[PDB]
Amino acid sequence: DLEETGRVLSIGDGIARVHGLRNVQAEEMVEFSSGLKGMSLNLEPDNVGVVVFGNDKLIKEGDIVKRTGAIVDVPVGEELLGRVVDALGNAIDGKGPIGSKARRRVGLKAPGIIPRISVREPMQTGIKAVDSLVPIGRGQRELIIGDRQTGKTSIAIDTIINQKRFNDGTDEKKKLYCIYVAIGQKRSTVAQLVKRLTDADAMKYTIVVSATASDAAPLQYLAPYSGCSMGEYFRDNGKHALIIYDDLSKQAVAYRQMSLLLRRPPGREAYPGDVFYLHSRLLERAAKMNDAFGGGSLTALPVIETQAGDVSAYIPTNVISITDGQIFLETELFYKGIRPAINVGLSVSRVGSAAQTRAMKQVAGTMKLELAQYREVAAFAQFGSDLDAATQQLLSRGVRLTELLKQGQYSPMAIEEQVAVIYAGVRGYLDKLEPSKITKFENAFLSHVISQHQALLGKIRTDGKISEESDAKLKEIVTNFLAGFEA
Amino acid sequence: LDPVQKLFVDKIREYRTKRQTSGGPVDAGPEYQQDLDRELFKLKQMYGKADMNTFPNFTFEDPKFE
Amino acid sequence: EVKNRLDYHISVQNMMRQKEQEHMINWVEKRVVQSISAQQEKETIAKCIADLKLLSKK
Amino acid sequence: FAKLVRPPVQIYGIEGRYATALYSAASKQNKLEQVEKELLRVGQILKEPKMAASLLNPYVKRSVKVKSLSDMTAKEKFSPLTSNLINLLAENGRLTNTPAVISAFSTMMSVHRGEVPCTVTTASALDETTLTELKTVLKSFLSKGQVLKLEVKIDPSIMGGMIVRIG
Amino acid sequence: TTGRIVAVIGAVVDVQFDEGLPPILNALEVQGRETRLVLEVAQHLGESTVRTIAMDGTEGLVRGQKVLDSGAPIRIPVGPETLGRIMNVIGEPIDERGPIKTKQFAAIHAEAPEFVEMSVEQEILVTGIKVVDLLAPYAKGGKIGLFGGAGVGKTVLIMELINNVAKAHGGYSVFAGVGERTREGNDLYHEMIESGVINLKDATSKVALVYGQMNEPPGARARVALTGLTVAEYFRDQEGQDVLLFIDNIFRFTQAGSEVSALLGRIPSAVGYQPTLATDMGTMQERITTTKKGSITSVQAIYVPADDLTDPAPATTFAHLDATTVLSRAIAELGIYPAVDPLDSTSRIMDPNIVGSEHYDVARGVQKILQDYKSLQDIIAILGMDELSEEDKLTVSRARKIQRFLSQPFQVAEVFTGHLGKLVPLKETIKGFQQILAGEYDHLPEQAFYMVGPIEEAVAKADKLA
Amino acid sequence: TTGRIVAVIGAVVDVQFDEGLPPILNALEVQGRETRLVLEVAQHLGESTVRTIAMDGTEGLVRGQKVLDSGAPIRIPVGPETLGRIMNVIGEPIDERGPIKTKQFAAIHAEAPEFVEMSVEQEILVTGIKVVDLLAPYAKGGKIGLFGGAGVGKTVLIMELINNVAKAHGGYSVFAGVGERTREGNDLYHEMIESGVINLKDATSKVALVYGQMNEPPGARARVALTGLTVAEYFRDQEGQDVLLFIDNIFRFTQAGSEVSALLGRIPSAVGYQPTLATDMGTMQERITTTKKGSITSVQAIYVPADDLTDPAPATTFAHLDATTVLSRAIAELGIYPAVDPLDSTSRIMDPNIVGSEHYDVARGVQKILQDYKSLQDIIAILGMDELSEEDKLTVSRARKIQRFLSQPFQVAEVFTGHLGKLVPLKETIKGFQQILAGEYDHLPEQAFYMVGPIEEAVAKADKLAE
């Protein structure tokens, strides 16, 4: 013990000018007397500018900063599944400890292209809207963009809920380690959220990395990186992990603030631009790996919050340029009613079809388009000014179909159901119905086919790719059922 | 080793006398009881009330029609 | 109606175990905190381990 | 610009930057020792009016300040040619600031082959050898003293919190 | 420890503490200062010198003067006696009803609880204002933010709210006056007396007024919310209470915070605003909650900068807002007491899945109906009722009736409303408007529904008429 | 000599070299850095302490740590063994296929060639995309910047070009991936093998890939660009080649420059900028040219930061360009793919003189037509029609047809489109518009032009759209 202690050369503002610790590792997380961590980020010749991790007033000059002698890793493992952690990967749940006494570096990198293998994957969220228009593969970076309970979260839950079934399945490939990185998410929010998951007990394959609202800026800062390591684990264990970063908007804020506090300056939106480097680096590690990693994935569903709907916003623009499409949720529709509330138009997965599932694809090919046409008539029509019978159907139909992508909170679907309810409309069987009666139909129709035509449904899933037989079967089933639903 | 354990001894001993004196477990400490009453009260609020400690009282809630 | 009965008892005893912890913690810390230095041999056992540091550290 | 040697101390506390002047200068020619000791004289030779507000006082006027060192350090042969930095630092106002240089320096040929406790137990015995914490633990284990409070006394502290720290 | 003034640059006194070094946020009382000239430690600058903040005058301060570290932050008197009492920031009596005599003292800070500590499920606190509950369902422990007309019986309403809940439900209230006009607070005092939510007869009435008016140095105004928060946390947990924390006015607070950010030489982040705006908030908002004990249900006056709020703070605040209160001048103009804007009384916790589909739906039918009625209002504004379908006529009448039914007389204010006021237990309340939804009443004077309480009292008033 | 880490202040490693002071740019090797650690000397800070930039994995580092100066810049393989290969900055297979052995090595800094060696003249080069050539007729061996925001099918579009062109194009092409998404390279990669343009039966593919993904240290990302350039310089000059230099995305290069600027003790200029932007540019773009050895025809993805072009960076850029493709968020938003901002997808080399007037004029007629149309928009936006004349309507409509006609499907991204996309040999274009202009189309459904290339097909498409 010489330089395994150092004295806080001076402290204020979580920047611990640190005496000693020069023998330090670069990027060493160090340890305070307050037991608090810091990272000796900047090794200046004089002191170590230590970004002090945490929030304080709990320190004073000359306090001992002891090397921890360690570069950050974050506890990693599958034992965070069934765990809600704080950013450091410590409990807040207080369910005793994790099992993730393995740790793995937050400093770990993005695959080589050779280590990576492009996405062709399915992965569905159970959300009709999603799976239809942005059907998901794995490894992918896809922006969820949506706002302050637009049920912004609700959706994610349903997605996760959908993955439950795979995690209740034995198909790892359809299983997902869900990682919900919570940035800024107040405790109440979290409390509910967690609670929800518990209830859904999808929690079992699920990490919730939670840096709530109060949390220190570096923590929140780190948190993604933490997350960044953790899913990669699963990924190298061939597993398909899902990280939800909700949200980096807060991170950036924190970071900038942090930077500014470092006197380190910025540019655009008062942010320093390597907030990009931050994210880029963060985001590149999202991948669908080559085969070498068990072909794993860490599928990233980043989330971004639009202040005033704005995206032209540097940080949003950034994130978009990284992401492999964006899912716009458009709240007006929510006021307007609509659950979910989406700008579908903006909702794109450029990846799109690469991320698909053939069962759906059979209706979905047609559907994306019919909705496209519907949308085309959202655009062509759907003012206070546009119709002919052709389009009137598309509109009618469209409106109907809208209801099908409408979707309650705390509730995703199985794909076969999705194809089903959709199917009716694709071949135009419920345009007969008003928009209003669709959901009712859908509900009914669904419990009916579940009841009888699980035969069919099971089957449609089974061939994973519809067939005329199914179609035909469906067709009577539905039509007649439809007839039954109505009359 | 010892130095560290040297603290534990001193504690452990005191516990023995305490737990082995439950009626006045050496140092019930008037303050302890004062806190007790505070926290007992709040639990009563959370949990509802009652006339008696054991079997309480009952009344048959009768449905009602228009 | 029963459970409310029982839970009141539990909760007191639970809280009493913590209050005994806080009061015992204060009391044990207030009891044992004095004649430490009167054992100079608690800095000998430091010297102990400290010569077994400065030896057993290299 | 001048290829030189800045040996232990180093560290560049500015007065480490200063020290480093003589950490190459005294050090070369090894008027290290001359000066090392010179300083020792000077510090307390200084700090009274021949330092204080009968000097340091800016209201002395800088040239005059030279001409009260160069009347204060060419007042003393304790800087027979390392005076000049004095007379420079003088100008460069680093007069109250000399201890740090002096230290740094003096240390830079003492802390230029020493060691000091920095340890999770008591000392301030200090040492003048590079290899150490072996020797010393035989002076520790020997003499008993210090503030005791002086270094870690791993008792009130660590240990002291610990039951509390469990709860 | 003692510090010395080493620098006074305004009420930022950078103190060299000579002896030792007392941690950040140690509250210091300056020695030789008879004035409770508190300095709060901010940075340990090195050299046992801190930059600290006086939040109090710097009147004649001869430097080096000794400041005695109180070694911790504030102790402020805190206790039940804060109900019915006026303190300034420093907890002194500006009540001048002698000191607010308490037992407990407090550091004006308090924490963001841990996850475990909470009532982790948030359940509606009911306001008894029909309009309110219905449209903005209030959450126990939450932050509800008051956009609102100025003195539009603002205070009155607020007083009435205190009445309605904190009385009704055995709640507690704290009023934190941040950066207000001493005059208006003075007025408020009399109002508070008047309202009897403060009794001059109770220094334990029902409301603690904690004031850190504009005239204070920033720090004081800056802290006065926290301070209050700190009281309320006692009150919450310890006093187990559902505290209503009336907060005037986070904006001015926000503003105040930033003022020092600059002047602290800190960089206050974007748009000028304190970089820690988020964390200060985070911790603050996170200081607020429902625990296993009480709730600090927080009523926050929100000055809306530039009627704009994209400006980051409120945008963020929106995140911290859970039920949102806009008081309507329009509704006020309509003479309505409640003057609330009902179609703004919302809660992001509004949802059929969340705040339940009845509330939500009943409301949706209504909100819609009103809106529909409004849609028609536009039409009607020209066209009248005549050529409208009867259903519209009905909706109009009902809407109006409902409207009138939203109208609720107020107590103390025999003067604005014309009466004494009524409280409206939710169950009847909503049920009431809904009854109008069944259209039962649609054969009656609708301005009988005007200024009433339970739905019955609306029907009843019709009856005396016809 | 040897340096000591004196400061790692970010990945700016201030290394104090005591008795060494090798010139600026010199690659310094951190001793013990297994992460092949070039520090590039940036400043002689004084004290023979240098500002360097660490360009590799860094952590573990202690102050003092030993650096052995390589005493010169990086040498990276330059020349042909890179085709196929995906190289990193330091010239290193990140194709990961054993080493890369192009025996000519390089310091990746070079000059602006002579004016006489510069393009004093160039020629319109057809692309066969209507809009593209038409408004932005392209010059061989020049620098063309493609402004366009984020993932806008930007990539799609470039790819489509690449597809059309790099394929067609016999020469080498260089792809310098600045901040390029690892993924995007992955797809591309897999494609590249697939496409068999890269086939590894030819490490003299027509394409060298240099990828410098955004995960990289900014400094690294910044320099990967030069790397690609240096190689391409190899190819131009040495291999005499008509190089296509695919740059995705020059913005990130710059972005890295600006980003670092602060930390360099430089001031992060307007918007935070690199004040060295210009010089960066000057040196970079001016390094590119058509020599009379080869041509480096440069396709530069230019992200429009935060959609600001006024933004100094893009603002600068224009000077260095010869053709700008500014993609319109609106056009894009109309789903129109081509998603162009045609009213700034340009080439200075638009002129009857050059491109023949027909092209030119037609274009000018168009440019105009849109322009006029543009003018109206502000009124009409709330205020509909009939407060306008119907010839205005005609132009509007025509402009609109034209609009749709620029929409020209994407053969590549059938994944995105479902459509098969078109290449329009020039005449169908020139003619195409002449006809619409001629009113020859002005009674057809506008969707006829929508997602078509050749105008006939638009007619064909019309007929069926006319049921």
UniProtKB/Swiss-Prot annotation, chain B:
This is ATP synthase peripheral stalk subunit F6, mitochondrial. GO terms for biological process: proton motive force-driven ATP synthesis. One of its GO terms (cellular component) is proton-transporting ATP synthase complex. GO terms for molecular function: proton transmembrane transporter activity. Belongs to the eukaryotic ATPase subunit F6 family. It comes from Bos taurus (Bovine). Keywords: Acetylation, CF(0), Hydrogen ion transport, Ion transport, Membrane, Mitochondrion, Mitochondrion inner membrane, Phosphoprotein, Transit peptide, Transport. Subunit F6, of the mitochondrial membrane ATP synthase complex (F(1)F(0) ATP synthase or Complex V) that produces ATP from ADP in the presence of a proton gradient across the membrane which is generated by electron transport complexes of the respiratory chain. ATP synthase complex consist of a soluble F(1) head domain - the catalytic core - and a membrane F(1) domain - the membrane proton channel. These two domains are linked by a central stalk rotating inside the F(1) region and a stationary peripheral stalk. It is found in: Mitochondrion; Mitochondrion inner membrane. The modification N6-acetyllysine is found at residues 6, 11, 44, 49, 64. The gene is ATP5PF. It comes from the Eukaryota. The modification N6-succinyllysine is found at residues 49, 64.
UniProtKB/Swiss-Prot annotation, chain D:
Keywords: Acetylation, ATP synthesis, Hydrogen ion transport, Ion transport, Membrane, Mitochondrion, Mitochondrion inner membrane, Transit peptide, Transport, Ubl conjugation. The modification N6-succinyllysine is found at residues 67, 77, 135, 139. Coiled coil: none annotated. GO terms for cellular component: mitochondrial inner membrane; mitochondrion; proton-transporting ATP synthase complex. One of its GO terms (molecular function) is proton-transporting ATP synthase activity, rotational mechanism. It is found in: Mitochondrion; Mitochondrion inner membrane. The modification N6-acetyllysine is found at residues 31, 37, 47, 50, 77, 135, 139, 149, 153. Subunit OSCP, of the mitochondrial membrane ATP synthase complex (F(1)F(0) ATP synthase or Complex V) that produces ATP from ADP in the presence of a proton gradient across the membrane which is generated by electron transport complexes of the respiratory chain. ATP synthase complex consist of a soluble F(1) head domain - the catalytic core - and a membrane F(1) domain - the membrane proton channel. These two domains are linked by a central stalk rotating inside the F(1) region and a stationary peripheral stalk. This is ATP synthase peripheral stalk subunit OSCP, mitochondrial.
Swiss-Prot record, chain E:
The modification Phosphothreonine is found at residue 254. One of its GO terms (biological process) is proton motive force-driven mitochondrial ATP synthesis. The modification Phosphoserine is found at residues 357, 375. Mg(2+) 1 binds at residue 155. Disulfide bonds: none annotated. It is a peripheral membrane protein. Mg(2+) 2 binds at residue 180. The keyword ATP-binding applies. ADP binds at residues 151-156. The modification N6-acetyllysine is found at residues 66, 103, 140, 201, 206, 368, 422, 427, 464. ATP binds at residues 151, 153-156, 181. It comes from the Eukaryota. One of its GO terms (molecular function) is ATP binding. Catalytic subunit beta, of the mitochondrial membrane ATP synthase complex (F(1)F(0) ATP synthase or Complex V) that produces ATP from ADP in the presence of a proton gradient across the membrane which is generated by electron transport complexes of the respiratory chain. ATP synthase complex consist of a soluble F(1) head domain - the catalytic core - and a membrane F(1) domain - the membrane proton channel. These two domains are linked by a central stalk rotating inside the F(1) region and a stationary peripheral stalk. PANTHER family: ATP SYNTHASE (PTHR15184), ATP SYNTHASE SUBUNIT BETA, MITOCHONDRIAL (PTHR15184:SF71). Homotrimer. Component of the ATP synthase complex composed at least of ATP5F1A/subunit alpha, ATP5F1B/subunit beta, ATP5MC1/subunit c (homooctomer), MT-ATP6/subunit a, MT-ATP8/subunit 8, ATP5ME/subunit e, ATP5MF/subunit f, ATP5MG/subunit g, ATP5MK/subunit k, ATP5MJ/subunit j, ATP5F1C/subunit gamma, ATP5F1D/subunit delta, ATP5F1E/subunit epsilon, ATP5PF/subunit F6, ATP5PB/subunit b, ATP5PD/subunit d, ATP5PO/subunit OSCP. It comes from Bos taurus (Bovine). The gene is ATP5F1B.
UniProtKB/Swiss-Prot annotation, chain F:
The keyword Lipoprotein does not apply. One of its GO terms (cellular component) is mitochondrial inner membrane. Phosphate binds at residues 151-155. CDD domains: ATP-synt_F1_beta_C, ATP-synt_F1_beta_N, F1-ATPase_beta_CD. The modification Phosphothreonine is found at residue 254. It is a peripheral membrane protein. The modification N6-succinyllysine is found at residues 66, 103, 201, 206, 464. Its EC number is 7.1.2.2. It catalyses: ATP + H2O + 4 H(+)(in) = ADP + phosphate + 5 H(+)(out). InterPro entries: AAA+_ATPase (IPR003593), ATP-synt_VA_C (IPR055190), ATP_synth_F1_bsu (IPR005722), ATPase_a/bsu_AS (IPR020003), ATPase_alpha/beta_chains (IPR050053), ATPase_F1/V1/A1_a/bsu_N (IPR004100), ATPase_F1/V1/A1_a/bsu_N_sf (IPR036121), ATPase_F1/V1/A1_a/bsu_nucl-bd (IPR000194). Catalytic subunit beta, of the mitochondrial membrane ATP synthase complex (F(1)F(0) ATP synthase or Complex V) that produces ATP from ADP in the presence of a proton gradient across the membrane which is generated by electron transport complexes of the respiratory chain. ATP synthase complex consist of a soluble F(1) head domain - the catalytic core - and a membrane F(1) domain - the membrane proton channel. These two domains are linked by a central stalk rotating inside the F(1) region and a stationary peripheral stalk. This is ATP synthase F(1) complex catalytic subunit beta, mitochondrial. It comes from Bos taurus (Bovine).
